Paper text:
Compound A was co-crystallized with hPD-L1 in a dimeric form and the obtained crystals diffracted to the 2.49 Å resolution. Crystallography studies revealed that compound A can indeed bind PD-L1, but through a hydrophobic pocket, which is created between two PD-L1 molecules thereby stabilizing a PD-L1 homodimer. This compound A-induced dimer interface includes the residues needed to interact with PD-1 protein, thereby resulting in potent PD-1/PD-L1 HTRF. Compound A interacts with both protein subunits, burying 276.0 Å2 of chain A and 271.0 Å2 of chain B. Both left-hand side (LHS) and right-hand side (RHS; ethylamino) ethanol form hydrogen bonding interaction with Asp122 of chain A and chain B, respectively. The LHS and RHS pyridine rings form π–π stacking interactions with Tyr56. The LHS amide linker carboxylate makes water-mediated hydrogen bond interactions to Gln66 of chain A and a similar interaction was observed on RHS to chain B. The central benzyls bind between Ala121 side chain of one chain and Met115 side chain of the other chain. These aryls also form van der Waals interactions with Asp122, Tyr123, Ile54, and Ser117. The two linked central benzyls are rotated by −106° with respect to each other at chain A:B interface.
Residue numbers in the entry:
A (entry chain A): 18 to 138
B (entry chain B): 18 to 136
C-alpha cells in the first residue's frame, strides 16, 4: 500500500551537465523526519543516506563527494530528488531510491550518459 | 549504522529440495513489531512482504504461492529466515532481504540450483 513511483525510469543526460532524478512517496500533513529513511545508491555505491533527518558524509562514496545532494525542500511534496552535478560517463547505470516511511518501497532508475559530441548541421 | 548481515551469500541447492536463506539484523529486548518491515524478493518478484506483523498473501508472486514462508519464531533472535519448499530450476538467481527496524539495510544472496543428476 506504501508505494514509491517514478515519473520516468530512464534519464538520458549530456556529459558534464546537472541531472535531478525523482522518487515520489505519499506524505500527508507533518513530514515525520524521525520516521523517514531515504537511500540512493548506484550498484552498491552509497550516494545519499538520509536517516531520520541526519546525513553522515563520511559514508558517501568518494566518486559522489561534492556532486550529489538530496533536495530536502522537495520532501514535503513527497519528492526524494537526487541532484548530481557535472555528470560523468561512469554515472551511467542503475540507481535505486529506497524509502522507509510508514511502509517501505523502492524503484530502479536507469541513467544513460551520452558521449560528449560536437553536433553540427 | 543499522546493519543487516548474511552468514552465507551463496547457497547451492538440489532440485526439488527445501532451502532456508538467512538475514541477521540487530534486535535488543522486545522486538517492536509495529516498527519492523521484512521484504524478500528475487528479480522483482515479491516473495515475502512482512509489514508491521501483517502479510498479504495476495501480493505474493504466483511462482512462490504455498512454497515460501518467513519463519517468524526466528525474528525475536534477529533472524529473517526465508524457507522455500520444492526448489525449482527458476529459483536460481539473486535474492534480496530488505529490513527496516530503526534503521534500514539490505543484503544480496545468490542461489544456484543443481540440475537433477543420478549417482
Ligand atoms: C533497504 C531499505 C533502505 N536501505 C538503506 O537505507 C540502505 C543503506 C545502506 C545500505 C548499504 N549498506 C551495506 C552494509 O550492509 C543499504 N541500504 C532504505 C529505505 C528502505 C529500505 C527498505 C527496507 C525494508 C523493505 C524495503 N522494501 C520493501 O518492503 C518492498 C516491498 C515491496 C516492493 C515492491 N513494490 C513495487 C511497487 O512499487 C519493494 N520493496 C525497503 C526498500
Amino acid at each position: 500500500a506504501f508505494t514509491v513511483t517514478v515519473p520516468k525510469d530512464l534519464y538520458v543526460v549530456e556529459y558534464g551537465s546537472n541531472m535531478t532524478i525523482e522518487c515520489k512517496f505519499p506524505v500527508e500533513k507533518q513530514l515525520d523526519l524521525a520516521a523517514l529513511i531515504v537511500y540512493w545508491e548506484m550498484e552498491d555505491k552509497n550516494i545519499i543516506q538520509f536517516v531520520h533527518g541526519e546525513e553522515d558524509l563520511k559514508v558517501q562514496h568518494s566518486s559522489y563527494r561534492q556532486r550529489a545532494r538530496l533536495l530536502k525542500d522537495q520532501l514535503s511534496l513527497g519528492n526524494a530528488a537526487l541532484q548530481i552535478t557535472d555528470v560523468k560517463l561512469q554515472d551511467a547505470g542503475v540507481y535505486r531510491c529506497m524509502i522507509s516511511y510508514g511502509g517501505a518501497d523502492y524503484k530502479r532508475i536507469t541513467v544513460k550518459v551520452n558521449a560528449p559530441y560536437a553536433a553540427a548541421l
